């Protein structure tokens, strides 16, 4: 069908999913977490489930870091 890139600087924050290894396509629901990354909202939503631990920096995020309501 159809195919994208990518156009900009990146350094390690925003680029990709990396919980399940992906891509990040604008206009999805999306989620962002606090621990400098950003991944698919089912990804989060089952890494928090199954697991407990930001993927890339390792350290327990516990969940309820953000507010919520
Ligand atoms: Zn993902
Ligand atoms: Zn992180």
């Given at each position: ?29 999306v989620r962002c977490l606090?621990?400098?990354?950003l ?31």
């Open positions: 069908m159809k195919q994208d890139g990518e156009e900009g600087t990146e350094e390690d924050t925003e680029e990709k999913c990396t919980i399940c290894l992906s891509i990040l396509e604008e206009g999805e629901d606090p621990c400098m990354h991944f698919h909202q089912v990804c989060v939503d089952q890494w928090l489930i199954t697991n407990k631990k930001c993927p890339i920096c390792r350290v327990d995020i516990e969940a309820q870091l953000p507010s919520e309501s």
